[PDB]
Design goal:
This is part of a larger assembly, with chains A and B. Chain A has 2 helices and no strands. Chain A is an all-alpha fold. The chains are: A mainly alpha, B mainly alpha. The PDB classes it as hydrolase.
Chain lengths: 58, 62
């Protein structure tokens, strides 16, 4: 700011940047899809695991 | 002597000419907003995908 000698715009953009300092708001969308995915995955995983464990001993 | 004459003349008899801040604006890039937060929208919600995926690729692990 002390470089500029036309300074009446550095206060403008300083305050505008610090005003709009949140430039994007948070996203957590992986809490609805991740649990659903995890349920099907877990089910299938466990099914495979138990099935093959049984077969090994058979 | 001549130094004094020059000093006197220069300082006194003319100074800066007009020059407006408004005219300056044209020659500089002005501040503009960072429009859009740019929210991402949830993808693959529900077991619609899951049923599709379980069924769709049946290729077993080898």
């Amino acid at each position: 700011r002390s470089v500029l000698k036309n300074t009446s715009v550095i206060d403008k953009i300083e305050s505008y940047v610090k005003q709009y300092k949140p430039v994007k708001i948070d996203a957590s969308k992986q809490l609805q899809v991740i649990e659903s995915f995890e349920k099907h995955a877990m089910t299938n995983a466990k099914e495979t695991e138990s099935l093959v464990s049984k077969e090994l001993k058979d | 002597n001549v130094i004094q004459d020059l000093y006197l003349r220069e300082l006194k008899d003319t100074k800066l000419a007009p020059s407006t801040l408004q005219d300056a604006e044209g020659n500089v890039k002005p501040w503009n907003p960072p429009q859009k937060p740019n929210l991402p929208e949830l993808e693959l919600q529900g077991p619609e995908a899951l049923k599709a995926y379980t069924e769709q690729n049946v290729e077993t692990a080898h």
